């Protein structure tokens, strides 16, 4: 067994981390007080769930997580929330004033005076790991902390933990649920300094999570709780292989081996289905073919884009519930003959499939209904580059006039770091086009 340490940076990271660990505990039968009646090894054991949870002599199962936020209002929710008993104070780090949506402020000004503290707290969680695999970093692109402090934390993690893998769960900025105009700057600043330090990054466009909540859950105006409860389902499906007995994606290294043949192009697109409303009278349960077929509909993708006009480099299918290999192959045969699935000629045209028989756990009283089977597809498509083009374009609109640039220079950044970061994106868009278009 090998341990995985989770790191949540900024409000978005912290709140999403709350929704996940709430979900992990329901899935592994862990109670709010950290007790686990099913764990027969008291105070120890190297089971698959131990990759995310340590154990105390008293029988408590404590997440391997650290929460970092430059302002204490969001992390105070954790210290007094339902799962306060899970964490101990060392795990929750909070400043006194945030980064004001300014990457420079999170990375340089504030980040310099607190970076050495985070590493120490993380070092304390590493000292409990007999064979640490790496880290999962949750954060946002727009937030000053999620963008600015994360990129720094990643630069140092690659120095203190050289051989360890690092995966991101990044939140893509979406105006429908954002009040910050400079989030393009931050996103493009953080992607530049974080690129050579992250091995695999699952971007989630809030715009996508938003419309899925309005369309499938009939939420007229979804709250962050709604978006997070859904995002924690996707995250749960992606981390399940690490927390449950299995042979596919059993360690963080396998994520890069299976999904990222080229280093810079490490942004798999995630698709999830079905998303069914709990308030519904009673839904006709979908078959294996119907839910797999939905994985190629743009409405169910974590980032809105058209994979039909890209090329696949890899592709995984993670099933949970009543699914047997026989049914998986049948649906795939029928989808190839109907869909436009073009692979790059230097990669095989195949699917790695993993199945966990335990169906998805739904948060009691949440928005999602209990289904008997569900799937999550991770496909590395050049079509996700559409997201970068959108973002880079907005960056050019504001930067052409240097709007808001004085706020970054004022915290110590150089104006040259903008264009330097932008040129790195222009190269990232070029690598995508070199791989996909003819």
């Amino acid at each position: 067994m090998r341990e995985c340490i989770s790191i949540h940076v900024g409000q978005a990271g912290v709140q999403i981390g709350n929704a996940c660990w709430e979900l992990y505990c329901l899935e592994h039968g862990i109670q709010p007080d950290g007790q686990m009646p099913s764990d027969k090894t008291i105070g120890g054991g190297d089971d698959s769930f131990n990759t995310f949870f340590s154990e105390t002599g008293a029988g408590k199962h404590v997440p391997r997580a650290v929460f970092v936020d430059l302002e204490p209002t969001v992390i105070d929710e954790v210290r007094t929330g339902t799962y306060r008993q899970l964490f101990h104070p060392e795990q929750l780090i909070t400043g006194k004033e945030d980064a004001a949506n300014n990457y420079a402020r999170g990375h340089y000004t504030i980040g310099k005076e607190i970076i050495d503290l985070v590493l120490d707290r993380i070092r304390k969680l590493a000292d409990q790991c007999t064979g640490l695999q790496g880290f999962l970093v949750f954060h946002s692109f727009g937030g000053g902390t999620g963008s600015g402090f994360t990129s720094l934390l990643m630069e140092r993690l690659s120095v203190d933990y050289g051989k360890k893998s690092k995966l991101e769960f990044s939140i893509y900025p979406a105006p429908q649920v954002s009040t910050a105009v400079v989030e393009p700057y931050n996103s493009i600043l953080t992607t530049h300094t974080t690129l050579e330090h992250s091995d695999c990054a699952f971007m989630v466009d809030n715009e996508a999570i938003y419309d899925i909540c309005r369309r499938n859950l009939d939420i007229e105006r979804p709250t962050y709780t709604n978006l997070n409860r859904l995002i924690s389902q996707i995250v749960s499906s992606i981390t399940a292989s690490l927390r449950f007995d299995g042979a596919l994606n059993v360690d963080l290294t396998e994520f890069q081996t299976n999904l990222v043949p080229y280093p810079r192009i490490h942004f798999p697109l995630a698709t999830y289905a079905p998303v069914i409303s709990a308030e519904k009278a009673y839904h006709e349960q979908l078959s294996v073919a119907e839910i797999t077929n939905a994985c190629f509909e743009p409405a169910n993708q974590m980032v809105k884009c058209d994979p039909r006009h890209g090329k696949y480099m890899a592709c995984c299918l993670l099933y949970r519930g009543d699914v047997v290999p026989k049914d998986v192959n049948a649906a795939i045969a029928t989808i190839k003959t109907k869909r436009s699935i073009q692979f790059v000629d230097w990669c095989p045209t195949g699917f790695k499939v993993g199945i966990n028989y335990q169906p998805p756990t739904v948060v009691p009283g949440g928005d999602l209904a209990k289904v008997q089977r569900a799937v999550c597809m991770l496909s590395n498509t050049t079509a996700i580059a559409e997201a970068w083009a959108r973002l880079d374009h907005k960056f050019d609109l504001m930067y052409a006039k240097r709007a808001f640039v004085h706020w970054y220079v004022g915290e110590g950044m150089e104006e040259g770091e903008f264009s330097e970061a932008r040129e790195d994106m222009a190269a990232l868009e070029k690598d995508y086009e070199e791989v996909g278009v003819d």
Partner: protein
Amino acid sequence: MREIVHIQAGQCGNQIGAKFWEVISDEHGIDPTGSYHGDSDLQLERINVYYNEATGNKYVPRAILVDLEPGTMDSVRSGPFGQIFRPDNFVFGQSGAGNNWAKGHYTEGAELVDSVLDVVRKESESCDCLQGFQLTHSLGGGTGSGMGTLLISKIREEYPDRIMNTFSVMPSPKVSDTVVEPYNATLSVHQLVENTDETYCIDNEALYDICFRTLKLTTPTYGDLNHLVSATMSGVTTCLRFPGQLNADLRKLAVNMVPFPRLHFFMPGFAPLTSRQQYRALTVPELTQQMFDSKNMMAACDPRHGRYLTVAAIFRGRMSMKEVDEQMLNVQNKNSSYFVEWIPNNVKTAVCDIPPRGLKMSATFIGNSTAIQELFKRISEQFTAMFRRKAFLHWYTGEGMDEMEFTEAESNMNDLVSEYQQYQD
């Protein structure tokens, strides 16, 4: 615990600030004695942003009252909520400023400034984490203008990394105490362009016309103009006083509203504005159509004459947040020719459930429009109409100033206009 320190200077500054604390104190359930008697927890959630908590559960406004004559502040203390202000926080002189900037900035004011900063330093030392300062004052007088800016110049020196916010009443000849108001305003505007992160421009003419034409007040008073500023001030600060994620603290609001350091002068706006047909429920489309109408704006600048750099709206009350988005997105998609296209998503919207006193719902408007240059163009044209003959300069030269310092303020604001002009094309 993100506390704000309040300063109000001069006659206008203190009469507006007074009514301001009357309005929000009511919203937070604070009676004139400092005791809380509300019925909701949202009132106290962010209460310590503007109030200090004393013994016996008493709430004391974190406000400093400043003036060079006792008259105005003696009325505040005997006024409605006068007993709530900290006694020590009354710092005042006896000479007066005679509506002279030079007196408030160099002579009389300079004799009293160190003692005001002694109180500011005392309120700050008690803040767990100080956000920044907000000053209420007029620019056409002598104290709020001359000493007000002198205070900002010194607060920035002692607190260089805190946000400096001001509510500045701009002078207009149609609502005038003295002919020298353009002189005092031109001199202050330069200080603000240098040492303020955010200045809410409030033209007394715009306030006058709104009372005369829209509110059907046959003979407005300064009190009537101050009712608007009270409501407006209560509005723009809603983001700060209640649980909200949008424009939460002062620095985050600046990072989203000021794309250039010197263009930080906003046009505020309120809605509804109803004359006494006052009980009619106001719909969300009505709130939005009026909120953007120039007649509801308090800068006296026609927005359709310039372009919007950024916009922040705030809707208060129990309403359909879905219907708010539909209508906001409607106004943008119906007049996209007045919003700059090189700043994506430069129109944000925040919802609050607690409506102001007496209204089911309302909307407050905060605009960073280039049309504000019309305000500084009026002030400059009036400044030059007199300075070209050196009229009334003797009031200032007698206090130590030189004609050169006037020529500089002149060129400094003409620059400010030229700056707002290149971004309108």
